[PDB]
DNA sequence: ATCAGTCTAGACATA
DNA sequence: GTATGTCTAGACTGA
Protein backbone atom coordinates (compact mmCIF):
# COMPACT_ATOMS: atom_id res chain seq x y z
CA UNK A 1 0.00 0.00 0.00
CA UNK A 2 1.36 3.32 -1.49
CA UNK A 3 2.29 6.69 0.16
CA UNK A 4 -0.13 8.84 -1.82
CA UNK A 5 -2.74 6.10 -1.61
CA UNK A 6 -2.22 5.71 2.15
CA UNK A 7 -2.80 9.40 2.71
CA UNK A 8 -6.05 9.50 0.77
CA UNK A 9 -7.19 6.36 2.56
CA UNK A 10 -6.71 8.25 5.82
CA UNK A 11 -9.76 10.35 4.92
CA UNK A 12 -11.84 7.38 3.72
CA UNK A 13 -15.05 6.70 5.61
CA UNK A 14 -15.71 3.18 6.83
CA UNK A 15 -18.68 0.98 6.04
CA UNK A 16 -21.01 0.39 8.98
CA UNK A 17 -19.38 -3.01 9.40
CA UNK A 18 -15.85 -1.58 9.44
CA UNK A 19 -16.97 0.93 12.07
CA UNK A 20 -18.68 -1.83 14.06
CA UNK A 21 -15.48 -3.85 13.87
CA UNK A 22 -13.57 -0.98 15.46
CA UNK A 23 -15.92 -1.07 18.48
CA UNK A 24 -15.69 -4.84 18.75
CA UNK A 25 -11.90 -4.73 18.92
CA UNK A 26 -12.04 -1.70 21.19
CA UNK A 27 -14.33 -3.68 23.45
CA UNK A 28 -11.95 -6.67 23.48
CA UNK A 29 -8.89 -4.58 24.28
CA UNK A 30 -10.75 -3.12 27.27
CA UNK A 31 -11.13 -6.66 28.62
CA UNK A 32 -7.55 -7.67 27.86
CA UNK A 33 -5.84 -4.60 29.37
CA UNK A 34 -6.93 -5.78 32.83
CA UNK A 35 -5.18 -9.17 32.55
CA UNK A 36 -1.40 -9.30 32.73
CA UNK A 37 0.23 -9.78 29.35
CA UNK A 38 -2.97 -10.58 27.45
CA UNK A 39 -2.44 -7.67 25.04
CA UNK A 40 1.16 -8.55 24.30
CA UNK A 41 0.03 -12.13 23.71
CA UNK A 42 -2.85 -11.24 21.42
CA UNK A 43 -0.39 -9.00 19.57
CA UNK A 44 2.01 -11.96 19.40
CA UNK A 45 -0.48 -14.30 17.75
CA UNK A 46 -1.55 -11.85 15.04
CA UNK A 47 1.97 -10.52 14.31
CA UNK A 48 3.71 -13.95 14.21
CA UNK A 49 1.14 -16.33 12.67
CA UNK A 50 3.32 -19.42 12.26
CA UNK A 51 4.65 -19.46 15.83
CA UNK A 52 2.19 -20.93 18.36
CA UNK A 53 0.60 -18.72 20.96
CA UNK A 54 -1.19 -19.31 24.24
CA UNK A 55 -4.91 -18.70 24.57
CA UNK A 56 -6.27 -15.18 24.91
CA UNK A 57 -9.64 -15.39 26.64
CA UNK A 58 -12.70 -13.49 27.86
CA UNK A 59 -15.39 -14.67 30.31
CA UNK A 60 -18.17 -16.70 28.75
CA UNK A 61 -21.72 -15.48 28.76
CA UNK A 62 -24.46 -17.85 29.87
CA UNK A 63 -25.82 -18.36 26.37
CA UNK A 64 -22.26 -17.86 25.09
CA UNK A 65 -23.07 -14.69 23.13
CA UNK A 66 -21.34 -11.33 23.32
CA UNK A 67 -22.99 -7.98 22.70
CA UNK A 68 -20.96 -5.12 21.24
CA UNK A 69 -22.59 -1.82 20.23
CA UNK A 70 -26.12 -3.33 20.15
CA UNK A 71 -25.13 -6.46 18.13
CA UNK A 72 -24.96 -10.02 19.43
CA UNK A 73 -22.62 -12.71 18.14
CA UNK A 74 -20.30 -15.52 19.33
CA UNK A 75 -16.83 -14.45 20.61
CA UNK A 76 -14.58 -16.67 18.51
CA UNK A 77 -16.71 -16.09 15.43
CA UNK A 78 -16.59 -12.31 15.85
CA UNK A 79 -12.83 -11.95 16.36
CA UNK A 80 -12.05 -14.55 13.69
CA UNK A 81 -13.91 -12.35 11.19
CA UNK A 82 -11.79 -9.37 12.17
CA UNK A 83 -8.40 -10.95 11.81
CA UNK A 84 -8.68 -14.06 9.61
CA UNK A 85 -11.82 -14.61 7.51
CA UNK A 86 -13.89 -11.47 6.93
CA UNK A 87 -16.62 -13.54 5.22
CA UNK A 88 -16.94 -16.12 7.99
CA UNK A 89 -20.60 -16.87 8.39
CA UNK A 90 -21.25 -18.88 11.58
CA UNK A 91 -19.65 -20.94 14.33
CA UNK A 92 -20.24 -24.05 12.18
CA UNK A 93 -17.47 -22.91 9.84
CA UNK A 94 -15.07 -22.93 12.82
CA UNK A 95 -13.50 -25.80 14.80
CA UNK A 96 -10.81 -25.52 17.45
CA UNK A 97 -7.14 -26.45 17.23
CA UNK A 98 -5.88 -28.92 19.82
CA UNK A 99 -3.50 -26.26 21.13
CA UNK A 100 -6.41 -24.22 22.58
CA UNK A 101 -7.26 -24.83 26.25
CA UNK A 102 -10.50 -22.74 26.23
CA UNK A 103 -12.49 -23.33 23.05
CA UNK A 104 -16.01 -22.07 22.61
CA UNK A 105 -17.65 -25.46 22.99
CA UNK A 106 -15.64 -25.95 26.18
CA UNK A 107 -18.56 -24.63 28.21
CA UNK A 108 -15.96 -23.39 30.70
CA UNK A 109 -15.95 -20.11 32.59
CA UNK A 110 -13.65 -18.64 29.91
CA UNK A 111 -13.66 -18.69 26.11
CA UNK A 112 -10.55 -18.21 24.00
CA UNK A 113 -10.82 -15.68 21.19
CA UNK A 114 -7.33 -16.31 19.81
CA UNK A 115 -8.09 -16.43 16.05
CA UNK A 116 -5.20 -18.82 15.46
CA UNK A 117 -6.56 -21.40 17.88
CA UNK A 118 -9.39 -22.15 15.46
CA UNK A 119 -9.49 -23.59 11.95
CA UNK A 120 -11.98 -22.59 9.28
CA UNK A 121 -13.69 -25.41 7.39
CA UNK A 122 -16.79 -25.74 5.22
CA UNK B 1 -60.09 24.51 16.80
CA UNK B 2 -60.53 23.72 13.07
CA UNK B 3 -60.63 20.08 11.97
CA UNK B 4 -58.26 20.89 9.12
CA UNK B 5 -55.90 22.51 11.63
CA UNK B 6 -55.83 19.22 13.53
CA UNK B 7 -55.25 17.20 10.37
CA UNK B 8 -52.38 19.42 9.31
CA UNK B 9 -51.04 18.96 12.83
CA UNK B 10 -51.41 15.20 12.37
CA UNK B 11 -48.67 15.38 9.74
CA UNK B 12 -46.42 17.42 12.02
CA UNK B 13 -43.10 15.79 12.76
CA UNK B 14 -42.23 15.65 16.45
CA UNK B 15 -38.97 16.71 18.06
CA UNK B 16 -36.83 14.05 19.69
CA UNK B 17 -38.52 14.76 23.03
CA UNK B 18 -41.99 14.34 21.59
CA UNK B 19 -40.96 11.01 20.09
CA UNK B 20 -39.16 9.93 23.29
CA UNK B 21 -42.28 10.66 25.29
CA UNK B 22 -44.31 8.37 23.05
CA UNK B 23 -41.79 5.61 23.70
CA UNK B 24 -41.88 6.30 27.45
CA UNK B 25 -45.66 5.96 27.44
CA UNK B 26 -45.44 2.76 25.42
CA UNK B 27 -43.05 1.36 28.00
CA UNK B 28 -45.41 2.10 30.87
CA UNK B 29 -48.48 0.82 29.04
CA UNK B 30 -46.57 -2.35 28.27
CA UNK B 31 -45.92 -2.69 32.01
CA UNK B 32 -49.47 -1.79 33.09
CA UNK B 33 -51.31 -4.28 30.83
CA UNK B 34 -49.80 -7.01 33.05
CA UNK B 35 -51.56 -5.57 36.15
CA UNK B 36 -55.32 -5.89 36.62
CA UNK B 37 -57.33 -2.80 35.71
CA UNK B 38 -54.39 -0.46 36.28
CA UNK B 39 -54.94 0.93 32.80
CA UNK B 40 -58.59 1.56 33.57
CA UNK B 41 -57.49 3.32 36.77
CA UNK B 42 -54.80 5.46 35.18
CA UNK B 43 -57.36 6.76 32.71
CA UNK B 44 -59.73 7.51 35.59
CA UNK B 45 -57.11 9.74 37.18
CA UNK B 46 -56.20 11.50 33.96
CA UNK B 47 -59.85 11.88 32.94
CA UNK B 48 -61.23 13.16 36.29
CA UNK B 49 -58.61 15.34 37.97
CA UNK B 50 -61.03 16.41 40.66
CA UNK B 51 -62.05 12.87 41.61
CA UNK B 52 -59.34 11.22 43.72
CA UNK B 53 -57.73 8.07 42.32
CA UNK B 54 -55.90 5.05 43.69
CA UNK B 55 -52.17 4.58 43.20
CA UNK B 56 -50.85 3.26 39.87
CA UNK B 57 -47.43 1.65 40.37
CA UNK B 58 -44.45 0.13 38.52
CA UNK B 59 -41.52 -1.86 39.91
CA UNK B 60 -38.84 0.13 41.69
CA UNK B 61 -35.29 -0.04 40.39
CA UNK B 62 -32.39 -0.22 42.82
CA UNK B 63 -31.14 3.28 42.19
CA UNK B 64 -34.76 4.27 41.59
CA UNK B 65 -34.20 5.37 37.98
CA UNK B 66 -36.06 4.09 34.97
CA UNK B 67 -34.58 3.70 31.51
CA UNK B 68 -36.54 4.26 28.30
CA UNK B 69 -34.88 4.08 24.89
CA UNK B 70 -31.43 4.84 26.31
CA UNK B 71 -32.58 7.69 28.59
CA UNK B 72 -32.59 7.56 32.39
CA UNK B 73 -34.84 9.64 34.63
CA UNK B 74 -37.02 9.21 37.63
CA UNK B 75 -40.36 7.46 37.02
CA UNK B 76 -42.64 9.91 38.76
CA UNK B 77 -40.84 12.85 37.12
CA UNK B 78 -40.99 11.23 33.67
CA UNK B 79 -44.73 10.60 33.75
CA UNK B 80 -45.45 13.86 35.53
CA UNK B 81 -43.68 15.63 32.66
CA UNK B 82 -45.99 13.85 30.24
CA UNK B 83 -49.38 14.57 31.76
CA UNK B 84 -49.19 17.51 34.16
CA UNK B 85 -46.19 19.84 33.90
CA UNK B 86 -44.14 19.30 30.75
CA UNK B 87 -41.45 21.68 32.07
CA UNK B 88 -40.74 19.82 35.31
CA UNK B 89 -36.97 19.75 35.92
CA UNK B 90 -36.12 17.40 38.81
CA UNK B 91 -37.55 15.54 41.77
CA UNK B 92 -36.86 18.61 43.99
CA UNK B 93 -39.86 20.26 42.33
CA UNK B 94 -42.11 17.33 43.35
CA UNK B 95 -43.60 16.29 46.67
CA UNK B 96 -46.15 13.51 47.21
CA UNK B 97 -49.77 13.86 48.19
CA UNK B 98 -50.90 12.31 51.43
CA UNK B 99 -53.24 10.12 49.40
CA UNK B 100 -50.38 8.18 47.79
CA UNK B 101 -49.30 4.94 49.49
CA UNK B 102 -46.31 4.32 47.13
CA UNK B 103 -44.48 7.63 46.69
CA UNK B 104 -41.06 7.95 45.10
CA UNK B 105 -39.07 8.56 48.23
CA UNK B 106 -40.84 5.76 50.15
CA UNK B 107 -38.22 3.24 48.95
CA UNK B 108 -41.02 0.64 48.62
CA UNK B 109 -41.42 -2.31 46.22
CA UNK B 110 -43.63 -0.40 43.76
CA UNK B 111 -43.60 3.26 42.80
CA UNK B 112 -46.72 5.20 42.05
CA UNK B 113 -46.59 6.97 38.71
CA UNK B 114 -50.01 8.56 39.11
CA UNK B 115 -49.37 12.23 38.22
CA UNK B 116 -52.25 13.32 40.41
CA UNK B 117 -50.56 11.83 43.48
CA UNK B 118 -47.88 14.51 43.47
CA UNK B 119 -47.76 18.28 43.85
CA UNK B 120 -45.20 20.58 42.29
CA UNK B 121 -43.22 23.02 44.42
CA UNK B 122 -40.72 25.64 43.32
CA UNK B 123 -37.30 24.22 44.28
C1' DA C 1 -19.95 12.71 46.72
C1' DT C 2 -25.54 12.78 44.11
C1' DC C 3 -25.88 13.02 39.49
C1' DA C 4 -25.68 11.48 34.82
C1' DG C 5 -24.11 8.90 31.24
C1' DT C 6 -22.66 4.75 28.70
C1' DC C 7 -22.41 -0.31 27.96
C1' DT C 8 -24.06 -4.92 28.01
C1' DA C 9 -25.60 -9.48 30.21
C1' DG C 10 -29.62 -11.42 30.88
C1' DA C 11 -34.59 -11.75 29.90
C1' DC C 12 -37.98 -11.70 26.79
C1' DA C 13 -40.13 -11.83 22.18
C1' DT C 14 -40.55 -12.79 16.98
C1' DA C 15 -39.10 -15.12 13.08
C1' DG D 1 -36.84 -24.60 16.70
C1' DT D 2 -32.75 -22.23 17.42
C1' DA D 3 -31.56 -18.39 15.71
C1' DT D 4 -31.63 -13.35 15.85
C1' DG D 5 -33.14 -9.44 17.43
C1' DT D 6 -35.09 -5.86 21.12
C1' DC D 7 -35.09 -3.68 25.66
C1' DT D 8 -33.43 -2.23 30.04
C1' DA D 9 -31.76 -3.01 35.28
C1' DG D 10 -27.49 -3.21 37.04
C1' DA D 11 -22.60 -2.33 36.77
C1' DC D 12 -19.57 0.99 36.07
C1' DT D 13 -17.39 5.17 34.92
C1' DG D 14 -16.79 9.86 35.66
C1' DA D 15 -18.62 15.02 37.90
ZN1 LIG E 1 -6.97 -20.85 22.59
ZN1 LIG F 1 -49.90 7.07 44.52
Amino acid sequence: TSPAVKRLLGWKQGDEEEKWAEKAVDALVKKLKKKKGAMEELEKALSSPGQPSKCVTIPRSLDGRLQVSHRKGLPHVIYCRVWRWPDLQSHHELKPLDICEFPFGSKQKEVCINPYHYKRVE
Side-chain angles (χ1 to χ4, degrees), chain A residues 42-100:
Chain A
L42 178 70
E43 225 169 277
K44 169 196 202 308
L46 307 171
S47 56
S48 315
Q51 318 201 307
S53 36
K54 315 165 65 172
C55 288
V56 184
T57 62
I58 73 175
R60 179 201 178 78
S61 71
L62 298 194
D63 78 338
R65 295 201 285 178
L66 170 77
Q67 172 175 317
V68 182
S69 173
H70 311 304
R71 186 173 302 184
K72 265 182 171 52
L74 305 145
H76 58 306
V77 182
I78 299 186
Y79 292 99
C80 275
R81 264 201 212 103
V82 180
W83 289 300
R84 299 201 73 203
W85 312 284
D87 62 49
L88 187 59
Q89 291 277 34
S90 78
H91 69 324
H92 295 298
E93 304 203 46
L94 278 175
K95 268 207 163 57
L97 298 192
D98 294 346
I99 299 83
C100 179

